[PDB]
């Protein structure tokens, strides 16, 4: 029964993640259920904290209500006690605990998604985690989930060294996604986020030098196309 949910994960659009020396990167494709639909109204790559993002493979809805339940747990169980935001390791723990309970609870099915959660905490540095429907979670240098899972996972072993700059890992995760792509391949059908330098540009305010802004940045429709030309 957990086994059947991992199966809904095995199909459903491919997504991936790559840790580097100075950043993390996660991406998936935006398969348009129609051309009539405006694909900018749905986000497969969601912000959890300004230091932490997430992507999935599988059941759309189960991801949404998991991204919501997940943002909240970041406050209710960490920020409202210690004044900081949670560290990747622990926010991940609190999500696994959330899914692991849909498993061992009666009257409910587990979630139809595997999650890739990427982020940076001051003490543990960068890290990238996978969370399964089983509630188990593992730390990755890089991996992929979904259909293209096997092709891409093999390409990542081939191309990954522990000396990658974040720009190198963006480059990789675009190629990796180019071979699996189901629909068209541009900035309107690729979602890519990074966990890099602090972006003060994006704080919304200026006056306390101790807080410096989001590490999580979601690349614009433009930034993507720009990289795909010099590709």
């Amino acid at each position: 029964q957990i086994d059947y949910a991992l199966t809904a994960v095995k199909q459903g659009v491919t997504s991936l993640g790559i840790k580097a020396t100075n950043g993390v990167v996660i991406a998936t494709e935006k398969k348009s259920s129609s051309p009539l639909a405006m694909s900018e109204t749905l986000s497969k790559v969601s912000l959890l904290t300004p230091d932490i993002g997430a992507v999935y493979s599988g059941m759309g809805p189960d991801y949404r209500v998991l991204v919501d339940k997940s943002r909240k747990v970041a406050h209710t169980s960490y920020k409202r006690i210690y004044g900081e935001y949670p560290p990747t390791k622990l926010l991940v723990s609190e999500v696994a605990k959330i899914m692991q309970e849909a498993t061992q609870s009666g009257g409910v099915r587990p979630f139809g998604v595997s999650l890739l959660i990427a982020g940076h905490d001051e003490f543990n540095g960068f890290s990238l985690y996978q969370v399964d429907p089983s509630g188990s979670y593992f730390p990755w240098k890089a991996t992929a989930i979904g259909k293209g899972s096997v092709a891409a996972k093999t390409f990542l072993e081939k191309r990954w060294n522990d000396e990658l700059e974040l720009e190198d890992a963006i480059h990789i995760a675009l190629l990796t996604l180019k071979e699996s792509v189901e629909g068209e391949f541009n900035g309107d059908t690729i979602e890519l986020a990074i966990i890099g330098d602090e972006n003060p540009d994006l704080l919304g305010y200026t006056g306390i030098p101790t807080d410096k802004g989001p590490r999580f940045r979601k690349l614009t429709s433009q930034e993507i196309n720009d990289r795909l030309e010099a590709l």
Binding site: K89, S127, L128, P139, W140, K141, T143
Partner: protein, 232 residues
């Protein structure tokens, strides 16, 4: 439960002889813990997890053989019992009492048969000033048992034999560090043992006085004691 049998238990008791492989050896002046890591991919991040060796308090620690997500649910509640017995009696919790406290939650499902038993089997290594150094075991049966040396998980029946062979009561701590590695010569499905398939721990008579240091080994420190024979 047909012949006097605990079915849903044997189910998970033998699901244990699949995952992991863990060992505990009590020396005369220290204790030792050790484990092999699950089927690893090249890209899995070695150093982070500490996935099968968890600290419970500054004086107690457990080795796990079983489902990870399942033991974390237990350990979380055991790290707490520790601290409740502090805030309450202002003394560090005695090992047997912590062990029984878990064993009793395990057996809690072994009977209120409306929820599913526990994966997971524990070796506990701890010190308390009432019963010197201690070594314990915890199958989801609900039972715990005393041990001078022990093992859980795959290839269990096998190591118990080499252990019975090379063990001596006068044993030091470094002598027992070897016995543990040495006898993960056999009980290893992976031909040749690496520092990365490992996780280690010690509770010694302190790096200084008459007291008690605890030490979960960092990867490098393993490749260093592996150096003593294993691989070089």
């Amino acid at each position: 439960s047909p012949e006097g049998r605990l079915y849903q238990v044997e189910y998970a008791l033998e699901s244990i002889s699949h995952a992991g492989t863990a060992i505990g050896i009590m020396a005369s002046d220290g204790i030792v813990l050790a484990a092999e890591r699950k089927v690893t991919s090249t890209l899995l991040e070695q150093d982070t997890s500490t996935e099968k060796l968890y600290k419970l308090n500054d004086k107690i620690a457990v080795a796990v053989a079983g489902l990870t997500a399942d033991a974390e649910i237990l350990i979380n509640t055991a790290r707490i019992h520790a601290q409740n017995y502090l805030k309450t009696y202002n003394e560090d919790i005695p090992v047997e009492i912590l062990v029984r406290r878990l064993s009793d939650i395990k057996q809690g499902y072994t009977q209120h048969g409306g929820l599913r038993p526990f994966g997971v089997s524990f070796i506990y290594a701890g010190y308390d000033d009432r019963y010197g150094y201690q070594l314990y075991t915890s199958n989801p049966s609900g039972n715990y048992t005393g041990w001078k040396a022990i093992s859980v998980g795959a290839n269990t029946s096998a190591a118990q034999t080499l252990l019975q062979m090379d063990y001596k009561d006068d044993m030091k701590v470094d002598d027992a560090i070897e016995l543990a590695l040495k006898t993960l010569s056999k009980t290893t499905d992976s031909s040749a043992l690496t520092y990365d398939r490992l996780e280690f721990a010690t509770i010694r008579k302190g790096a200084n006085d008459g007291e008690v240091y605890q030490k979960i080994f960092k990867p490098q420190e393993i490749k260093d004691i592996l150096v003593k024979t294993g691989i070089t």
